[PDB]
Design a protein around this ligand. Structure first.
Ligand code: OHT
Ligand code: OHT
Lengths: 210, 208
């Protein structure tokens, strides 16, 4: 119906970012990896631009604004893809010009991993996830990254609170069929965190192995 | 008073002890062994405790085990975490085994324990109650996100039931915060992460 925060967040939303493949080089695990690497690099600058638009976010200390972006960037990237693929089935809308099926992923050796995000994508799909929910869960994810390098903990909390409140409230007017929808959304965050940490690790392994 | 929560409480297992076998002088191995032996004896208990969770038993033995399979670490972690609330910078795994910053460094569990302590840091901040504990334990169990389940609906129903119990509990004894249940739900990620880091670390011993 109308929530201050949710609307703000829809607006603060970033524009369509396209992967931009290299047509002259062959499709290998090094290509796909390289393709995603930069795709994320670009998004990371995109996200830092965005976070400033997160109501109450710019007010925290800089050292703390960095602490969170430091921790929650991967979940943000991830929830991102997870969203792009809701209207699709069994594949990943990493980029609107970059989609991967079971076979493109088998070639990239990201089967295990992608079969993980397919799962995450399944839940949200079975909940009929809404754009307004994405943006909110996304902001929450950030204000809930639990960095250990926090200096002013009472502030992080008020930021968490402000965003949590917007969720309960938006879910309150748009879905009275489910007096427990917000909290349900919230329970999908762990998997988000699980996937992201899985992602981070595969990366530290590819870097170890080469 | 909420029925489901009264149950979970009553179900709450009896105290367990690590019993730092009067055998080997303190050392990485001794330490790691003590925990290995306690976790196992706890795991058994957990299995039994599980039978009481409302609606848990009705599940096919296949699912029941798929959940336990995935959540047993969060459960173990949550325990020591609740056990450690009333303390400072120390992790209580058992009344006979209490790890302080140094004993940790000795076991190499500095990083692991240090994240676990972070978990406690938050629960202490919001004065976690035994009631809230027993309930999250059950919730974490059914919200374990296992990839290989048969009956998705029945499981979902179990998460709703327990979720209802939590939102309800907060609604009665904690009217001062309408977002409390949700905030408890928000501590689940960390628990997940920590339980994960904890597990990958165990397997990482002599492998690649
Ligand atoms: C899951 C795909 C992915 C990345 C990704 C995820 C979501 C998204 O929207 C875009 C990309 C990925 C790849 C590279 C990367 O690099 C960050 C480091 N920069 C500074 C070089 C981050 C994420 C990746 C992670 C680990 C190993 C290999 C690939
Ligand atoms: C966090 C301490 C811990 C365990 C633990 C946690 C909570 C608790 O109440 C009791 C113990 C731990 C240690 C061993 C273990 O083994 C399970 C596998 N069995 C079948 C051999 C599980 C957890 C541990 C985890 C990873 C590496 C080293 C130690």
């Amino acid at each position: 119906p109308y929530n201050k925060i949710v609307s703000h967040l829809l607006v603060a939303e970033p524009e369509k970012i396209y992967a931009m493949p290299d047509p002259t080089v062959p499709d290998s695990d090094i290509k796909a990896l390289t393709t995603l690497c930069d795709l994320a690099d670009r998004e990371l600058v995109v996200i830092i631009g965005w976070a400033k638009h997160i109501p109450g976010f710019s007010t925290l200390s800089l050292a703390d604004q960095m602490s969170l972006l430091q921790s929650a960037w991967m979940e943000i990237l991830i929830l991102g893809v997870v969203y792009r693929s809701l209207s699709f089935e069994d594949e990943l809308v990493y980029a609107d010009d970059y989609i991967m099926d079971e076979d493109q992923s088998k070639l990239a050796g990201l089967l295990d991993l992608n079969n993980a995000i397919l799962q995450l994508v399944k839940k949200y799909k079975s909940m009929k996830l809404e754009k307004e929910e994405f943006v909110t869960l996304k902001a929450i994810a950030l204000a809930n990254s639990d960095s250990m390098h926090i200096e002013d903990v009472e502030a992080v909390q008020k930021l968490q609170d402000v965003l949590h409140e917007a969720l309960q409230d938006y879910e309150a007017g748009q879905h009275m069929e489910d007096p427990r929808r917000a909290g349900k959304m919230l329970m999908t965050l762990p998997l988000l965190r699980q996937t992201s940490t899985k992602a981070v690790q595969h990366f530290y392994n590819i870097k170890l192995e080469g």
